[PDB]
Ligand binder design. Structure first.
Ligand code: FAD
Ligand code: FAD
Ligand code: CL
Ligand code: CL
Ligand code: CL
Ligand code: CL
Ligand code: CL
Ligand code: CL
Ligand code: NA
Ligand code: NA
Ligand code: NA
Ligand code: NA
Ligand code: NA
Ligand code: NA
Ligand code: NA
Lengths: 292, 296
C-alpha cells in the first residue's frame, strides 16, 4: 500500500501532524503501537481546552477527529524497520507499507532510577514535570531525587509548589557552589541512603526513618522509543537527559522527506508543544509534497 | 478598593493569552488576563486544524478555555482594553475603562487585525466565503471552484498551492503579471488566470468583473496584510520587525521581547497564523515568564 505520508506514532504529535495532511486532502496513514508516555496519570494539565481531562480521553477525541477524514487511515501496530526505497516500513505484524514521506512521532521512554517502590508510583505521586503535576500537591512537602546538574535547578524551582527537600541518596553530593545556592532558596539537603518509597510518597531510609512527602520529582533520563530515526540516518543529538532527533524550522530531519515532532525533538516534553510542532510538521510535509 | 499586584498580566485572552496564563496559574502565581473580546476568528462558524478541537465553534473553544483558566482562584479576568502600558520601579496598565492594573511582568497576546483590500462586498463575506488560510478552510470547499484574489508576488505561491483543494482561478486584478516560467507553472498546475479588474463581490461568492462578467466561486482567498492590534508593544519599547504581510513583535527562544520582563505570543510573533501555533508558543511564553519570576 502506498500513502502520501505515514506518521509513526499516533499520540498528540502524530495526530496533530496527520490532521494537517488529512485536511490537505492527501492520503495519510498513522501506525501506532498504543503506549503513550502519559498513560500513567489520571489527568493531563497545561493544555488550554484539555486542562484536567484524562489523557485517554484527549487521545481518543483526537483519533476520532482525525478519522472523520476518510483519506486518513489508522493501524495499531509497531514499525520495526524503515528504509529508503520513497520509504518502506516493516511492522512487527509482518505488514509492509510504503510512503513518499514520513513523520516521526513515536515519543520517548522514561528511564527511572532503580529505587524500590518508585516506578509503581510513576504518574500518581512521582513525576517529572512540575507544570504538569505540581499544583495538585497543594503546597505540601516535595522531594527532589538528586541525579546531576538539572536536579539542582529543579530543586531551586520547586519551592514554587511546596516545601522542597533535595535528596542525594548518599550518592549525588553537591559541591560548595550548589550547596550554598540551595540553602538560600530554603531547600533542605538530605544525604541519607534511601531503602524504598512507601505509602503515597514517603521516603524510607536504610536506617528505617521515614520522611513523608506529598510528591517526588525526578529529572530522569529518557530514550527514543524506536530506532527508526537512526535506521533512516536522521541526525541525533545527545541532550543532558537523553537523545533527540535534530530538526530545522520546518521540523524536517537531516534525511529529506522525513519529519519529526513531539517529545523526540528538542522543544518537547509537553502536550502543548507536541500539538504545536506536530502541526508545523504536518504542514511542512504537505508543502514538500507540492513544491518538493 | 483593595490594592492588587499581579505576578503577570496577559494582554489578550484568546488562544495565545489563555495558554500563557494557564501555565502561570499552574505555577501558583497571580495572573490577570485583560481581554477586549474581539478575536481574529470571530467570523467563521467552525475552527479547524487543532487536534481535539477540530470542527468546534471558535466561541465554544474560547469559552471552554476561559472556564478552565478561571477554575484556578489565583487567575483573574477583566473584560477591558489596555490603552497604555508603562514601566515603573514592574508595569502599570491603563485601560479604556479608567481602571489601572499593576504587574511584575507582562505577556503580550493581543493578536493582529486583518486589513482587507477595498473590494466592494469582500468585508461582508469575510469568514463566510472569503478567507486567508487554506489549511484552515480549504477542505470544506469540497473540491469546489476557488478564486485567489491577486495581491502581488505572494498570491502566486497561493495560487500554485490551491489546486490541492479545488479548481483554482488566479484573479490577478492588475496586482501581478506572471512572466513565462510562472505562466507555464500555473498552466501545468491547472490554474486559470483571469486578468480583468474586479468590480464587486455579490451574492454568496460571485466575482463581478469590470467588463460585467460574473464568475461563481465556492470560496475566495486573499493573502491580505495584517497589523498589530495594539500600540502597547511599541509603548513598552519592544522591537518590531516588518514581515512580508505586516509587522511582528520580535521574540527570542523564550518568547521574550527586547524589553526584559515583557513576553509575546500568538499571531503578533514571527511564527503565527494558526491556533495550534498560538497554543504552543503561548505555553512557552507562560513557562518562560514564570521562570523569570523565580530566577530573574
Ligand atoms: C507521568 C507523566 C505525566 C505527564 N503529564 C503531562 C501533562 O499533564 N501535560 C503535558 O502537557 N504533558 C505531560 N507529560 C508529557 C507528555 O506525556 C508528552 O509531552 C506527550 O505525550 C508527547 O506526545 P508524543 O506524541 O510526542 O509522544 P507519546 O504521547 O509518548 O506517544 C508516542 C506514540 O508513538 C507510539 N510508538 C512508539 N514506537 C512506535 C513504533 N515503533 N511504531 C509505531 N508507533 C510507535 C507509542 O506507542 C505512542 O502511542 C507527562 C509525562 C509523563 C511521563
Ligand atoms: C476568518 C478566519 C478564520 C480562521 N480560522 C482558523 C482555523 O479554523 N484554525 C486555525 O488554527 N486558525 C484560524 N484562523 C487564525 C486564528 O484566528 C489565529 O491564528 C488565532 O486566533 C490567533 O490567536 P491569538 O490569541 O494570537 O489572537 P486572537 O485570537 O486575535 O485574540 C487576541 C485577543 O486580544 C484582544 N485584545 C486586542 N487588543 C487588546 C488590548 N489593547 N487590551 C486587551 N485585549 C486586547 C482581542 O480583543 C482578542 O480577544 C482564522 C483566522 C480568520 C481571520
Ligand atoms: Cl510528569
Ligand atoms: Cl535529524
Ligand atoms: Cl535545538
Ligand atoms: Cl498594588
Ligand atoms: Cl510569590
Ligand atoms: Cl482564514
Ligand atoms: Na492538559
Ligand atoms: Na513521549
Ligand atoms: Na512534546
Ligand atoms: Na479558529
Ligand atoms: Na467561559
Ligand atoms: Na481579476
Ligand atoms: Na498564532
Amino acid at each position: 500500500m502506498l500513502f502520501d505520508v505515514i506518521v509513526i506514532g499516533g499520540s498528540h504529535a502524530g495526530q496533530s501532524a496527520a490532521l494537517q495532511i488529512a485536511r490537505a486532502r492527501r492520503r495519510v496513514l498513522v501506525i501506532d503501537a498504543g503506549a503513550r508516555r502519559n498513560r500513567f496519570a489520571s489527568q493531563s494539565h497545561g493544555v488550554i481546552g484539555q486542562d484536567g481531562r484524562s489523557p485517554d480521553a484527549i487521545a481518543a477525541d483526537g483519533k476520532a477527529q482525525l478519522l472523520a477524514y476518510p483519506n486518513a487511515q489508522w493501524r495499531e501496530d509497531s514499525v520495526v524497520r524503515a528504509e529508503r526505497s520513497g520509504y518502506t516500513l516493516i511492522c512487527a505484524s509482518g505488514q509492509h507499507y510504503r510512503a513518499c514521506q514520513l513523520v516521526l512521532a513515536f515519543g520517548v521512554v522514561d528511564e527511572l532510577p532503580e529505587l524500590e517502590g518508585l516506578e509503581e508510583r510513576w504518574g500518581e505521586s512521582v513525576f517529572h514535570c512540575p507544570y504538569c503535576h505540581g499544583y495538585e500537591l497543594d503546597g505540601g512537602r516535595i522531594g527532589v531525587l538528586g541525579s546531576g546538574p538539572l536536579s539542582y535547578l529543579s530543586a531551586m524551582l520547586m519551592p514554587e509548589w511546596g516545601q522542597t527537600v533535595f535528596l542525594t541518596d548518599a550518592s549525588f553530593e553537591p559541591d560548595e557552589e550548589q550547596r550554598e545556592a540551595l540553602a538560600r532558596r530554603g531547600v533542605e539537603i538530605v544525604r541519607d541512603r534511601i531503602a524504598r518509597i512507601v505509602d503515597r510518597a514517603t521516603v524510607e531510609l536504610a536506617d528505617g526513618r521515614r520522611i513523608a512527602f506529598d510528591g517526588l520529582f525526578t529529572m530522569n533520563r529518557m530514550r527514543l522509543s524506536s530506532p527508526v530515526a537512526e535506521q533512516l540516518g536522521c541526525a541525533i543529538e545527545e541532550g543532558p537527559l537523553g537523545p533527540y532527533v535534530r530538526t530545522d524550522d520546518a521540523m524536517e530531519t537531516s534525511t529529506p522527506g522525513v519529519f519529526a515532532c513531539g517529545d523526540i525533538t528538542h522543544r518537547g516534553g509537553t502536550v502543548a508543544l507536541a500539538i504545536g510542532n506536530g502541526a508545523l510538521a504536518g504542514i511542512a510535509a504537505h508543502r514538500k509534497l507540492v513544491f518538493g
